[PDB]
Amino acid sequence: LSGQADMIVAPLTINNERAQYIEFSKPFKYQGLTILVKKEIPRSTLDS
Amino acid sequence: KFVKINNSTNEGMNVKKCCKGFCIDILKKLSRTVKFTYDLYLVTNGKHGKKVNNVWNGMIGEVVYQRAVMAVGSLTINEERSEVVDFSVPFVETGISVMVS
Amino acid sequence: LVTTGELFFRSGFGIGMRKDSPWKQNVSLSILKSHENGFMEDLDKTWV
């Protein structure tokens, strides 16, 4: 909503708060949002 | 809906039989939010859409000819369909898969 | 690291645009045609 602009090609999630001023096209990738968690080496190796 | 009278007879009585499910709920919610009224009815000839000799077998055929606004149901977004009628934002992701056992 | 949980707030990405421009119909049709042609699937597989 500015000057040069004229298109946007990037990950831009579809949402209600952004669909009034502008409009999008048919989605080219369906993707939700998940949880990413850290990992550690298991201690149940019977080392002792 | 429309049901043919027996098999040989070409008449028919438009009986009333209420239908329900997944998409009907979203139709009801849309009606509540946008505050309009509807008189939904089932299709008569064929099923879904398949152009043949520049003729569509209902569904799409009943929206192209300005005979029924909107086509609520299980309609897959395609390449030729989007050129005749105008679709909206999808709400369920789907495609082609396999079912071997 | 590992990704756990289940998908929620499922949506899709999309190419942006400004207000109303003539590019809308052509862009949407081209994206749909590419999607149904398997080109997008192959490119995504190769790059991801």
From Swiss-Prot, chain A:
Subcellular location: Cell membrane; Postsynaptic cell membrane; Postsynaptic density membrane; Synaptic cell membrane
UniProt binding sites for glycine: P11, T13, R18
PTM summary: NMDA is probably regulated by C-terminal phosphorylation of an isoform of GRIN1 by PKC. Its phosphorylated state is influenced by the formation of the NMDAR-PPP2CB complex and the NMDAR channel activity.
Recorded disease: Neurodevelopmental disorder with or without hyperkinetic movements and seizures, autosomal dominant: An autosomal dominant neurodevelopmental disorder characterized by severe intellectual disability and developmental delay, absent speech, muscular hypotonia, dyskinesia, and hyperkinetic movements. Cortical blindness, cerebral atrophy, and seizures are present in some patients.
Record function comment: Component of N-methyl-D-aspartate (NMDA) receptors (NMDARs) that function as heterotetrameric, ligand-gated cation channels with high calcium permeability and voltage-dependent block by Mg(2+). NMDARs participate in synaptic plasticity for learning and memory formation by contributing to the long-term potentiation (LTP). Channel activation requires binding of the neurotransmitter L-glutamate to the GluN2 subunit, glycine or D-serine binding to the GluN1 subunit, plus membrane depolarization to eliminate channel inhibition by Mg(2+).
Entry domain remark: A hydrophobic region that gives rise to the prediction of a transmembrane span does not cross the membrane, but is part of a discontinuously helical region that dips into the membrane and is probably part of the pore and of the selectivity filter. The extracellular N-terminal domain (NTD) is a site of allosteric regulation to modulate overall receptor function.
Protein known as: Glutamate receptor ionotropic, NMDA 1
Covered residues, full protein: 506 to 553 of 938
UniProtKB/Swiss-Prot annotation, chain B:
Subunit structure, as described in the record: Heterotetramer. Forms heterotetrameric channels composed of two GluN1/zeta subunits (GRIN1), and two identical GluN2/epsilon subunits (GRIN2A, GRIN2B, GRIN2C or GRIN2D) or GluN3 subunits (GRIN3A or GRIN3B) (in vitro). Can also form heterotetrameric channels that contain at least two GluN1 subunits and at least two different GluN2 subunits (or a combination of one GluN2 and one GluN3 subunits) (in vitro). In vivo, the subunit composition may depend on the expression levels of the different subunits. Found in a complex with GRIN1, GRIN3A and PPP2CB. Found in a complex with GRIN1 and GRIN3B.
Localization: Cell projection, Dendritic spine; Cell membrane; Synapse; Postsynaptic cell membrane
This protein's encoding gene: GRIN2A
Species whose genome carries this gene: Homo sapiens (Human)
Protein name listed in UniProt: Glutamate receptor ionotropic, NMDA 2A
Sites where the protein binds L-glutamate: S74, T76, R81
Domain topic, free-text comment: Contains an N-terminal domain, a ligand-binding domain and a transmembrane domain. Agonist binding to the extracellular ligand-binding domains triggers channel gating. A hydrophobic region that gives rise to the prediction of a transmembrane span does not cross the membrane, but is part of a discontinuously helical region that dips into the membrane and is probably part of the pore and of the selectivity filter.
UniProt record similarity statement: Belongs to the glutamate-gated ion channel (TC 1.A.10.1) family. NR2A/GRIN2A subfamily.
Classification of source organism: Eukaryota, Metazoa, Chordata, Craniata, Vertebrata
Effect of T94M: In FESD; decreased protein abundance; decreased localization to the cell membrane; changed glutamate-gated calcium ion channel activity characterized by affected receptor kinetics
Residues with attached carbohydrate: N6, N7
UniProtKB/Swiss-Prot annotation, chain C:
Glycan-modified residues: N26
Record text on subunit structure and interactions: Heterotetramer; the NMDAR subunits are modular and harbor tiered domains that function in concert to regulate opening and closing of the cation-selective ion channel pore. Forms heterotetrameric channels composed of two GluN1/zeta subunits (GRIN1), and two identical GluN2/epsilon subunits (GRIN2A, GRIN2B, GRIN2C or GRIN2D) or GluN3 subunits (GRIN3A or GRIN3B) (in vitro). Can also form heterotetrameric channels that contain at least two GluN1 subunits and at least two different GluN2 subunits (or a combination of one GluN2 and one GluN3 subunits) (in vitro).
This protein's domain notes: A hydrophobic region that gives rise to the prediction of a transmembrane span does not cross the membrane, but is part of a discontinuously helical region that dips into the membrane and is probably part of the pore and of the selectivity filter.
Family note: Belongs to the glutamate-gated ion channel (TC 1.A.10.1) family. NR1/GRIN1 subfamily.
Disease affiliated with this protein: Neurodevelopmental disorder with or without hyperkinetic movements and seizures, autosomal dominant: An autosomal dominant neurodevelopmental disorder characterized by severe intellectual disability and developmental delay, absent speech, muscular hypotonia, dyskinesia, and hyperkinetic movements. Cortical blindness, cerebral atrophy, and seizures are present in some patients.
Subcellular location: Cell membrane; Postsynaptic cell membrane; Postsynaptic density membrane; Synaptic cell membrane
The protein, known as: Glutamate receptor ionotropic, NMDA 1
UniProt modification remark: NMDA is probably regulated by C-terminal phosphorylation of an isoform of GRIN1 by PKC. Its phosphorylated state is influenced by the formation of the NMDAR-PPP2CB complex and the NMDAR channel activity.
Gene: GRIN1
Top-level division of the source organism's lineage: Eukaryota
